[PDB]
């Protein structure tokens, strides 16, 4: 959905890049690894920047993996990560970019918001929603919903997959629920509040069936019980809100279905016995939901349009504005990254010249 200017790579290819041979840099890194010595962040950056073939991407993957297992792993500069994604997209290696993104622990790939949009858009342009879904999950794991452009792209892909998908596994419900709650809080509109309502319904279902621990374990979610309670609070907030905010009927139906399904139907207790369990509060939740549903319908706070239909209209109105802001900030990063790269090259050059002069004196 991103414009051609946003995904344009002319700016990236116009950087002042020093030409280096991959084999020479690969041989240099091998000698350092055998000596059990740290590898400079400049050396790995040159290796990534000098990728010129599809075959070279596989070789760079190993050294990127080895750099993650080096004492200087934390010094992996951001532009190297962005270049890595740019190289993968350039040589039709989207799977390689996704594989490192899934294995970010083993490779240290932590892209910024701008790069995540580029990777996500490539799957959307090719209608590869299966791979685009994983990218959204990676954003959910890395909590990269601070840019409105990423939030809009995530919502578009997530809602599109929800319509086709019918059977949900407990892991999938946790993933979809978490992946929708994060952008919903940022978006203060009808779609944003619907995502909060829809996301809480999926997470609340996991809490009662699979337990509270499964909700937040290795997830960016709170450990406090009451996901179903927070689902009802969204409806209460919409009930006292301007006419702009509305809740889609699809989200309301899903929450009602979850409550009815739960109503109809390792061993460590993580909650105090004095506190009321969420299972015992199910009849209370059902009574509250029916009252809120009638109140929202009476006030005309229910939107008849589907989630995908309303989200698509939302993208057409705000994506263009968000792209312009991201592009300008991306240009600033390129200027900032270029200055930092020069400093590292100068620092190495001064050290190498200083090392030789001291060696000559000795």
């Amino acid at each position: 959905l991103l414009s051609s200017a946003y995904v344009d790579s002319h700016k990236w290819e116009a950087r002042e890049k020093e030409h280096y041979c991959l084999a020479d840099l690969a041989s240099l890194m091998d000698k350092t690894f055998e000596r059990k010595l740290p590898v400079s962040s400049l050396t790995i950056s040159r290796l990534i920047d000098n990728i010129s073939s599809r075959e070279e991407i596989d070789h760079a993957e190993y050294y990127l993996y080895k750099f993650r297992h080096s004492p200087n792993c934390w010094y992996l500069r951001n532009w190297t990560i962005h270049t890595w994604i740019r190289q993968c997209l350039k040589y039709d290696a989207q799977d390689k970019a996704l594989y490192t993104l899934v294995n970010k622990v083993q490779y240290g790939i932590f892209p910024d918001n701008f790069t995540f949009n580029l990777l996500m858009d490539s799957f959307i342009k090719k209608e590869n929603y299966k791979d685009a879904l994983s990218v959204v999950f990676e954003v959910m794991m890395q909590e990269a919903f601070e840019v409105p452009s990423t939030q809009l792209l995530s919502l578009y892909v997530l809602f599109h997959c929800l319509a086709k998908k019918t059977d949900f596994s407990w892991e999938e419900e946790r993933n979809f629920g978490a992946s929708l709650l994060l952008p919903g809080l940022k978006q203060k509109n009808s779609v944003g509040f619907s995502s909060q309502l829809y996301g809480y319904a999926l997470l609340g279902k996991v809490e009662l069936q699979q337990g509270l621990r499964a909700v937040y374990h290795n997830m960016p979610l709170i450990w406090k019980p009451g996901y179903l309670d927070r689902a009802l609070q969204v409806m209460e907030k919409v009930a006292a809100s301007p006419e702009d905010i509305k809740l889609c009927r699809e989200a309301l139906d899903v929450l009602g279905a979850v409550l009815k399904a739960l109503t109809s139907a390792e061993k460590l207790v993580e909650q105090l016995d004095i506190e009321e369990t969420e299972q015992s509060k199910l009849p209370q939740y059902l009574e509250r939901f029916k009252a809120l549903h009638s109140k929202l319908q009476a006030l005309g706070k229910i939107e008849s349009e589907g989630l995908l239909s309303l989200t698509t209209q939302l993208v057409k109105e705000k994506l263009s504005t968000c792209e312009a802001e991201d592009i300008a900030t991306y240009e600033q990063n390129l200027q900032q990254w270029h200055l930092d790269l020069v400093q590292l090259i100068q620092r190495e050059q001064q050290q190498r010249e200083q090392a030789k002069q001291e060696y000559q004196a000795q």
């Binding site: 084999a23 690969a26 075959e55 596989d58 070789h59 993957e61 190993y62 993996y65 294995n103 083993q106």
Partner: peptide, 14 residues
């Protein structure tokens, strides 16, 4: 999770 297999190809010097 198997580690990547190290593969080295030499073409700089014929």
């Amino acid at each position: 999770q198997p580690p990547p297999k190290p593969v080295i190809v030499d073409k700089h010097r014929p």
